[PDB]
Amino acid sequence: DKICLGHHAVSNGTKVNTLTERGVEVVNATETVERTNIPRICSKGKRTVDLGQCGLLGTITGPPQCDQFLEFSADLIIERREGSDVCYPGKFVNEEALRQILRESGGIDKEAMGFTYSGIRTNGATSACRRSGSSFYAEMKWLLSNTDNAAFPQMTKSYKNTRKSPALIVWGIHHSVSTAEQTKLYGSGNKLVTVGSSNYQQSFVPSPGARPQVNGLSGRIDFHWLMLNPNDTVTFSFNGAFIAPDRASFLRGKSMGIQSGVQVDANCEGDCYHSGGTIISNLPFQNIDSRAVGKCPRYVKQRSLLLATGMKNVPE
Amino acid sequence: DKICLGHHAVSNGTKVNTLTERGVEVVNATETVERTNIPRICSKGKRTVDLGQCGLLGTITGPPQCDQFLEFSADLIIERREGSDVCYPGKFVNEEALRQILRESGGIDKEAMGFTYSGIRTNGATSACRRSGSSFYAEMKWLLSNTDNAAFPQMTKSYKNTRKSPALIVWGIHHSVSTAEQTKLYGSGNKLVTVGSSNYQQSFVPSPGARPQVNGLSGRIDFHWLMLNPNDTVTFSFNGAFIAPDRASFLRGKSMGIQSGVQVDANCEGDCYHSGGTIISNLPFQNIDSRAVGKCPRYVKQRSLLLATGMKNVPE
Amino acid sequence: DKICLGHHAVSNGTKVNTLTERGVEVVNATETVERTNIPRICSKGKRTVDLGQCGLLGTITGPPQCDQFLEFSADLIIERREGSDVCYPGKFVNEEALRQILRESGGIDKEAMGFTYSGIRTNGATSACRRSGSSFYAEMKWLLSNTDNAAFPQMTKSYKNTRKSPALIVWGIHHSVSTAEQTKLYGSGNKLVTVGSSNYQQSFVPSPGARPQVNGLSGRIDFHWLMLNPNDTVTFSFNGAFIAPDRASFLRGKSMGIQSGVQVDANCEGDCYHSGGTIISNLPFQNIDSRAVGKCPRYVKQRSLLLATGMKNVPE
Amino acid sequence: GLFGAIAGFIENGWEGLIDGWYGFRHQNAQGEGTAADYKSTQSAIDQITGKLNRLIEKTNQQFELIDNEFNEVEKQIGNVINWTRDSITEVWSYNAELLVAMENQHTIDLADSEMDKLYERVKRQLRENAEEDGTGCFEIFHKCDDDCMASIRNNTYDHSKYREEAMQNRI
Amino acid sequence: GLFGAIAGFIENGWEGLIDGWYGFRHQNAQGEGTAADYKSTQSAIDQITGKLNRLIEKTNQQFELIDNEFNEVEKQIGNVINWTRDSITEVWSYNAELLVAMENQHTIDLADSEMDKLYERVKRQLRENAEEDGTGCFEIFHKCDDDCMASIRNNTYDHSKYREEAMQNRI
Amino acid sequence: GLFGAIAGFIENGWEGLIDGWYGFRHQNAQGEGTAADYKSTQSAIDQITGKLNRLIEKTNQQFELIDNEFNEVEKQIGNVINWTRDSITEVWSYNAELLVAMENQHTIDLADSEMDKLYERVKRQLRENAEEDGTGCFEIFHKCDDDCMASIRNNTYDHSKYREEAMQNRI
Ligand SMILES: *[C@@H]1O[C@H](CO)[C@@H](O[C@@H]2O[C@H](CO)[C@@H](O[C@@H]3O[C@H](CO)[C@@H](O)[C@H](O)[C@@H]3O)[C@H](O)[C@H]2NC(C)=O)[C@H](O)[C@H]1NC(C)=O
Ligand SMILES: *[C@@H]1O[C@H](CO)[C@@H](O[C@@H]2O[C@H](CO)[C@@H](O[C@@H]3O[C@H](CO)[C@@H](O)[C@H](O)[C@@H]3O)[C@H](O)[C@H]2NC(C)=O)[C@H](O)[C@H]1NC(C)=O
Ligand SMILES: CCOC(=O)c1c(CSc2ccccc2)n(C)c2cc(Br)c(O)c(CN(C)C)c12
Ligand SMILES: CCOC(=O)c1c(CSc2ccccc2)n(C)c2cc(Br)c(O)c(CN(C)C)c12
Ligand SMILES: CCOC(=O)c1c(CSc2ccccc2)n(C)c2cc(Br)c(O)c(CN(C)C)c12
Ligand SMILES: *[C@@H]1O[C@H](CO)[C@@H](O[C@@H]2O[C@H](CO)[C@@H](O)[C@H](O)[C@H]2NC(C)=O)[C@H](O)[C@H]1NC(C)=O
Ligand SMILES: *[C@@H]1O[C@H](CO)[C@@H](O)[C@H](O)[C@H]1NC(C)=O
Ligand SMILES: *[C@@H]1O[C@H](CO)[C@@H](O)[C@H](O)[C@H]1NC(C)=O
Ligand SMILES: *[C@@H]1O[C@H](CO)[C@@H](O)[C@H](O)[C@H]1NC(C)=O
Ligand SMILES: *[C@@H]1O[C@H](CO)[C@@H](O)[C@H](O)[C@H]1NC(C)=O
Ligand SMILES: *[C@@H]1O[C@H](CO)[C@@H](O)[C@H](O)[C@H]1NC(C)=O
Ligand SMILES: *[C@@H]1O[C@H](CO)[C@@H](O)[C@H](O)[C@H]1NC(C)=O
Ligand SMILES: *[C@@H]1O[C@H](CO)[C@@H](O)[C@H](O)[C@H]1NC(C)=O
Ligand SMILES: *[C@@H]1O[C@H](CO)[C@@H](O)[C@H](O)[C@H]1NC(C)=O
Ligand SMILES: *[C@@H]1O[C@H](CO)[C@@H](O)[C@H](O)[C@H]1NC(C)=O
């Protein structure tokens, strides 16, 4: 009589790699690299804003495409490829820094700055910013002389941040297409805009000239911004070519921003996003997108790394 | 008769982690992550400079709070949160780059640039830079017209670096609170400051205007700097609003800079610093500060990682 | 009678390190860290361009030392310490970004931008750019007034990129030694250059003033650049002090760039380069140069790491 | 494997052993039988499962965007970012490859080890009443019916009960 | 452990073994005794100590300030710096966790191995004069007084000297 | 090693064993002999060789210049680049050191394992016809000529053929 010790086996095992060997067969194995993508932005549990045609920076200045987002609030902010920050052509200085500031802002809360003017027009408008007609940026005022070619009075406007978090202040410098336009809008002569606070000091002179036509216009606007500390004051000294702020922005709390080309799904829950959707996985690695953001499995170049979960397979 | 083999054990062992298990009890273990901080800057063997209320950049221009550091020499430079670079309000261009240059400089050696003046005042002073009375930056000269509203003569001043290492050159552009103040100080009309070397040339126009009061003053100074190669010359051409340099700076050798909020201890010896003190440890990891500098244990997010130094504990 | 089991040994083994011990002798070992350098740039199989005295950025503007590389094509680009981007004294702005663009371009292909002029001179020349006489950058035109002190007409020149890859656009700003010279060349008054595309808007003003003579000349020409997207247009608006481009550049394909001080060897083949030569090795690590580029062994600080390839050596 | 039972002196595995990782296959006058050993099977399963749970422990640092897919950032900072990201990617690919290889080597060796532990356990149960044939079987030198075999499997085999007979049969 | 001695066929450890890691517990007509084995203890201690000295090998790489705690650097470059540092921190947190886990697994297995080496050493000393009981004890089939035990412990036990007696008792 | 053969109960190696990693040295009336064992030698060589080929697996990652050796880049970004590069260089120096140390530990242990496996193979071949002396030798209790030794080396030794003689000689 005899008794034999042995172990189990299967007819077709799974090949894995070890320190000493490639493709050793084991009874069972499991995948560690995630390849399955959900081609939607899973936003269950998160206050989500799909900016669509609104560019993120536009939420501060307020072109028409951003009218519904002037005081948005979000945990997840989605930028789209068709979003535009502008209506009258122009661009922001240090734009990507401001975009990164706004992606984690949780949204913005606007507050009137209280500027009043006398001796000038404040209703500068363009048909590039259309709201049932010629309009302008909703949070700005295009200051002009009272009449064509009249002199623009030298002005000083100050705003004090009385709140407990820094205030986002944006202004613009307008570069007309020609000297005749700058004269017609602000009067002839040298133009200067100085902006100052306790940790900020800068100066701007307009540079008229023709630029390629964007939205029908060859002028440009340079948008500048600063963060105003609590109890600090920002002072604008200008005599023309100045796009004034009407309201300041304050950051609401915390959020994260992504850039996507796929729809939002409020019925799946995820924490790792890329432009192509959401990575929902318990696996520690992913081979989907090296630029994924959020709480993500680590991106690796391998498409598959099998972990042995059973003994070596020795069939019959 | 029998003889039995066995191993030692203790009633209460220490739990550690392995590849397959959390909290396996072993007879003995030792910590690898350092958590104990020495709340002082241990500086034995190192010429240490505690800047205190002196801002590091101030060592180049010389506000009153920096009088003790105008030609400092150090292996270790300590910045404090109360440090200020300025007395008359203003700020440097590329300020952080210059701070990084000075943190590793080993200190600075000043040398007169040899500028002499005629037909102007050279003793411009303010109650914001107080040395027993109204004064100014010790390394600069606030050039003014001889009398109120008198014309400031156009002049050119050049300096050749006759030494063997690059010279740190700093100048300022003065922005008055108003056109009236600029006229009172330098006379009416256009003001221009051009600065040129063999690889640098730049023009500056002052931008008068109201700014919030910092240290009682609503004007500002733009501080600019360049490195002048040996045998090269820097040339300043100006008719006002120019804060002239009196001395140039040369870097002494080598050092490192830290930012701390705790006292210095010349009786303890260390090589790894953070804002809260010194990390003195033989452990390979630390959980104190990820921004520690010097020769440091590697920061890890775990507060404790117990390394087994004994067998598995199987008590009776 | 007896039979004994045993293993082989050698009199002198090789010491290696393990997790528990330093310098344990094993029967055999092999090196993993590469220390052997080939002090030449091995370029077999690669279209190689040794730029020599031509600075890489010069290939865009075309000073004399770059005449042979105005439309170069390469897989490997070699920069030399004696390369110069300029002939007339000056420099590029954002030079390192452009160098990094051009190192991987595979070379450049030029295309006329089609600017024609009337009412001005286009034949600005200098004795610093010598081609059988006073000449200028082969790809640029120094626009001047028709006669001394004559007014420079306000001009607008546009160029549309009709190709499917971005166009590298370069222009220059001339900084005269004085306002009198600037007036002699372009007429009196302020000079302005505006440059705009769909994602770019910037202004440039010349900075006339006295500076040291470089090669006997105190003027400067600084070159600026942008990348113009397909279907996008660049517009220059200028009234003087403007160095116009004659041709735009397009990137050919792919390449890599190195900086070396050793000769080229078209008889050895390699894929990992540094300034001191080529690293040819099957070992996974190298201790030669931490800044090597290409397909390289991973740099480590250890000069030797012996991997055991045999059992522990137990001699008699 | 380091232990030389699995794929070692035990020449192959049993595809009919579907209720455990390790087991006994006996032969006596009543016929042949195969049963799984619970203790060794559960030991190996517990250790591999602990390794698996260890490898999927979630410790998730959050990372945010520093690049731009729609409007490319400035060239120099973009190259620094891309260089850093590629360096980090290479490090994590290496970590994943090495980790999975090492863990797989150790898993194979651990299953090998548990097989050997079961074999040695049975050997020590049988004492002087059996001899190893070298292929994982124990030649038992006395009649061992189904209840005797069951006493071997569940560790109640008393070697004394058969010692004198078995040692006599060995001559 | 991989060698199934410690926490294996040896059911538990001895809290009274205070002068070594491994040892012998004998009983004969003179009573019971416990002694530590020096060679096995010192072998294990030497290996763990070498591992420890390896882990505290000092490498003197200096890192300097690249951001600013009092005057925050520009936003974009600060976000890049923070991203890079957080990536490096995650790499070193992983390296530390994996290193300690692996070293602990190996330390446990190494102590298990040294225990097993001592056990096998004694078994080969005793040859045909004793039988394993399966709990780490050797039933000795001859009278073994305190000097006899001591000769087993310090490797001077001559099996021939007792073989005839022991064999006569095993059959 | 973890298996205590190569640096353990086998006191040292044979410098005259030039034909393999492991082998047999026999002693009988016809004299002394030494031969290499092919299966174990080739097993160890195969595993270490597979390890070596694994460690020199080439992956194609290209990195480009982001610094400048002739005209130094801006100070702040240059310090960031330097900090990152030094951090990565430290990561890879650590990875290389740890990788080589771990692989060396495992290589030594694996060779130890193959030695122990050969020894155990022979022990199971000899069954009840031999006894271990504790130094890696088997004292054979019957006359074993050169053909008998060769039958042990090439796994054709039939223990039954000599069993009665050897068993009688052991008592
Ligand atoms: C081959 O290996 C896979 C992977 O280990 C085995 O699947 C695993 O099976 C176990 C139990 O059947 C699962 O455990 C689960 O734990 C979770 C805890 O979150 C619990 O919610 C479940 O109810 C279950 O108890 C484990 O998740 C599962 N792993 C995967 C990746 O699906 C599989 O059983 C193995 N094949 C054979 C034939 O054994
Ligand atoms: C001591 O260790 C070294 C390192 O492994 C051994 O050298 C190795 O020897 C083998 C065969 O002798 C070489 O294999 C080769 O493969 C290449 C594939 O391209 C082939 O072209 C060759 O003809 C050869 O078959 C292996 O490359 C080589 N390794 C190194 C690093 O040189 C050496 O044999 C060991 N010494 C002893 C006594 O075993
Ligand atoms: C399979 C890979 O998973 C891991 O990388 C980690 C794992 C699982 S791998 C592992 C297994 C056993 C022991 C140590 C690590 N652990 C436990 C980590 C712990 C920390 Br703290 C950590 O930063 C990481 C790194 N992650 C977050 C990128 C891991
Ligand atoms: C000897 C060191 O070689 C390696 O580091 C790598 C190795 C060899 S280390 C190893 C050894 C046994 C089993 C698994 C990995 N492999 C497989 C890699 C796979 C990838 Br993906 C990878 O990025 C690297 C990293 N290289 C590019 C520096 C390695
Ligand atoms: C506990 C971790 O300690 C280490 O990280 C290192 C250790 C100890 S971990 C270890 C233990 C045994 C074998 C190899 C590594 N060594 C030897 C290093 C060697 C070099 Br080179 C190195 O750059 C590092 C990295 N240090 C400086 C952060 C280590
Ligand atoms: C294994 O070794 C045995 C013993 O030497 C070999 O058997 C002998 O072979 C030789 C030559 O063929 C004969 O002269 C002997 O008479 C054989 N002895 C016996 C008992 O048969 C055997 O051939 C070897 N096996 C292999 C595969 O080489
Ligand atoms: C701001 O001013 C208010 C009163 O004007 C004061 O109560 C508050 O403490 C100030 N905030 C800070 C940060 O000093
Ligand atoms: C436990 O380990 C530590 C560190 O290795 C050591 O200092 C201590 O003496 C050890 N304890 C005992 C009881 O050996
Ligand atoms: C600078 O010029 C002086 C003479 O004017 C000369 O002696 C010195 O060597 C020069 N230094 C360098 C670095 O060229
Ligand atoms: C091509 O460029 C022209 C400008 O001349 C523009 O009108 C047109 O929309 C562009 N085409 C596309 C597809 O953008
Ligand atoms: C960085 O890499 C991406 C691809 O991952 C590429 O599309 C992008 O152009 C690169 N950025 C720069 C600045 O080169
Ligand atoms: C083991 O099997 C025998 C035979 O059936 C039985 O008598 C005994 O109770 C079993 N022991 C256990 C613990 O189940
Ligand atoms: C980087 O992190 C520190 C601390 O985590 C934080 O104070 C700082 O604001 C961060 N930098 C930026 C640019 O957000
Ligand atoms: C071993 O113990 C015996 C009995 O006490 C003693 O006679 C002998 O000298 C010891 N041997 C050694 C090497 O200590
Ligand atoms: C970076 O390191 C190199 C040496 O590797 C040094 O020469 C260079 O000055 C450093 N860069 C900066 C910006 O400090």
From TrEMBL, chains A, B, C:
Family per record: Belongs to the influenza viruses hemagglutinin family.
Record PTM text: Palmitoylated.
Full-protein positions shown: 19 to 334 of 560
Function, in words: Binds to sialic acid-containing receptors on the cell surface, bringing about the attachment of the virus particle to the cell. This attachment induces virion internalization either through clathrin-dependent endocytosis or through clathrin- and caveolin-independent pathway. Plays a major role in the determination of host range restriction and virulence. Class I viral fusion protein. Responsible for penetration of the virus into the cell cytoplasm by mediating the fusion of the membrane of the endocytosed virus particle with the endosomal membrane. Binds to sialic acid-containing receptors on the cell surface, bringing about the attachment of the virus particle to the cell. This attachment induces virion internalization of about two third of the virus particles through clathrin-dependent endocytosis and about one third through a clathrin- and caveolin-independent pathway. Plays a major role in the determination of host range restriction and virulence. Class I viral fusion protein.
Keywords of the record: Calcium, Clathrin- and caveolin-independent endocytosis of virus by host, Clathrin-mediated endocytosis of virus by host, Disulfide bond, Fusion of virus membrane with host endosomal membrane, Fusion of virus membrane with host membrane, Glycoprotein, Hemagglutinin, Host cell membrane, Host membrane, Host-virus interaction, Lipoprotein, Membrane, Metal-binding, Palmitate, Signal, Transmembrane, Transmembrane helix, Viral attachment to host cell, Viral envelope protein, Viral penetration into host cytoplasm, Virion, Virus endocytosis by host, Virus entry into host cell
Record localization: Host apical cell membrane; Virion membrane
GO cellular component: host cell plasma membrane; membrane; viral envelope; virion membrane
Primary location: host cell
Positions glycosylated per UniProt: N28, N231
Record's protein name: Hemagglutinin
Taxonomic placement: Viruses, Riboviria, Orthornavirae, Negarnaviricota, Polyploviricotina
Disulfide-bond pairs as recorded: C42-C268, C54-C66, C87-C129, C272-C296
Any one biological process term the GO annotation gives: viral budding from plasma membrane
Binding site for Ca(2+): E71, D109, K110
Subunit and interaction comment: Homotrimer of disulfide-linked HA1-HA2.
Gene: HA
Membrane topology: Single-pass type I membrane protein
GO terms assigned for molecular function: host cell surface receptor binding; metal ion binding
Top-rank taxon, per record: Viruses
Organism encoding this protein: Influenza A virus (A/Shanghai/02/2013(H7N9))
